[PDB]
Amino acid sequence: REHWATRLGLILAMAGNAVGLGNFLRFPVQAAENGGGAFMIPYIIAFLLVGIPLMWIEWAMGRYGGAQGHGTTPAIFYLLWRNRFAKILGVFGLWIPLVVAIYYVYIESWTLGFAIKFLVGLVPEPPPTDPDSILRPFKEFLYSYIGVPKGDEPILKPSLFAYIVFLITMFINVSILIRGISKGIERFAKIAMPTLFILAVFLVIRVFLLETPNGTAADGLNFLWTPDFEKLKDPGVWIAAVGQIFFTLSLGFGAIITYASYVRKDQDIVLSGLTAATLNEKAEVILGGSISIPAAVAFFGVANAVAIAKAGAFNLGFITLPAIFSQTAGGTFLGFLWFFLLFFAGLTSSIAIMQPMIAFLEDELKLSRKHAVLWTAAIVFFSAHLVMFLNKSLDEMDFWAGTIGVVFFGLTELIIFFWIFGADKAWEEINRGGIIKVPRIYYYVMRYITPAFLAVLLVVWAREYIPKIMTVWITRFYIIGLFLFLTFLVFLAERR
Ligand code: MET
Ligand code: NA
Ligand code: NA
């Protein structure tokens, strides 16, 4: 079985798995929509009670399975719980990263295409002192690239350039993935993560220098770090906080498990997972939180920044921030750096979510690495046409697979590992070979606090939020077919 070549490379590949678009696009939106600093008290709490324990649990399950040649949750759930229903529940660990990949690589292609056009200077030229006169050209720029209808008709018409960039992005993902774990993902992570850090630091420094008559970036930093204890009672704040922790840490996507399956049987996983989780949080709260919101607040004020963030997740990243840059010296090249930062973040994360499907085809169906990568590329590329041309299909996939799915699967893996497989056996497997050992209190957090926390979250989410959500049926129909297809592939694997 393949294994990570170096200790540093494993850490940077796991950091590249965690540090993604969610750090710079989803997190600023989630923070601004939920009270700014009010979002930060539950966030930190969730990171301590859910993020860190589930990270260690997914690392342990990955390495345990990889020691037996299984990097995917169907086989791993069966090894932890010899039952056919465990294999069915494992199918979710292939279904989530596939559906997430279908729209995540497409969003990644957006960043690459915007990076290209901004580098070449093919950007709108707003008239040099109206907020709408500056925002509207970039709103049309994004709407033309993805093909947003001027009305609400549910058909999208992406530009030919966007489609070509999507093919190029799929090609780039394949070129990295086809070279394996050590010579592909690891070697590229060693390059992308320093590039990602440097770009983020330069953007943070440049944003800190922004001052307009409406405020400064310091006001955005204040808003982000001003506590609001009156929101701690709101369940919606905790739902967003835990969902953001799940998303940003790649928990419940099956990616951490698959990556950890290439960690050697005796190599450390406690400090490694802790370092990767800490690197992700530094990138998120320090770097991600200091670019979008501070620049937005500096130009528009705290009032309009929150309103723009409420306009959607893409508005802050693809319309507002490029427009704000368009009013500063050289801001087009600054916008290029922003989208290039986003692209490397998306790329290091997209290779991670597509590795589970690759690992299943390699481990269980005995396909070659080339054919596993190429067939995974085919399934993702083909299925992506649904997201490309059917309006609001991307949102439905992110809800079922990337939002409810990850929390349900996180509770599922925790219960299989710490309740069915054995709390003491799981604790021994987590701490085995660790350069440091997990604090004793976390044993009770993993056994009682985390599953009770996640169970209450899911119950609240089901009773209070999902009935309202219940052409979206086309997307539901298709992703159900994807689950049946993976179920059939699991059936073929066990029959072999
Ligand atoms: C594509 S891996 C899941 C998302 C990733 N953790 C992010 O923060 O963007
Ligand atoms: Na992240
Ligand atoms: Na990434």
- Which of 184, 266, 244 is CA-nearest to residue 16? 184
* Cβ atoms < 10 Å from Cβ of 364: 21
Q: How far is CA 39 from the centre of its chain?
A: 19
> Is 266 in contact with 64 (CB distance < 8 Å)?
no
The CA distance from 71 to 430, in Å, is 17
Q: What single DSSP character describes residue 414? A: H
Task: Give all domains of the chain, ordered by start, each with its CATH number.
Answer: 7-495 (1.20.1740)
Give the closest ligand to the alpha carbon of residue 15.
3
Residue 324 CA neighbour count, 13 Å, CB half: 28
Beta bridge partners of 216: 211
The CA distance from 77 to 58, in Å, is 12
Ligand 1, closest atom to CA 280?
8
The CA distance from 492 to 488, in Å, is 6
Is 476 labelled as part of a ligand binding site? no
Query: Which tokens in the block code for residue 382?
Result: 């083909």
Pocket test for ligand 1, best of 43, 248, 344, 357 (most atoms within 8 A of CB): 248
Q: What is the DSSP string of 31-73?
A: HHHTTGGGGHHHHHHHIIIIIHHHHHHHHHHHHHHHTTT--SH
For the Cβ of 349 lying below 6 angstroms from any atom of ligand 1, the answer is yes
- Residue 129: which residues within 8 A CB-CB, separation 6 or more? none
- Residue 434: which residues within 8 A CB-CB, separation 6 or more? 268, 269, 270, 271
First-last CA distance in the chain: 19
**Residue 248 C-alpha to ligand 3 middle, in angstroms?**
10
Experimental method: X-ray
The CA distance from 400 to 405, in Å, is 5
The CA distance from 276 to 272, in Å, is 6
For the Cβ of 359 lying below 6 angstroms from any atom of ligand 1, the answer is no
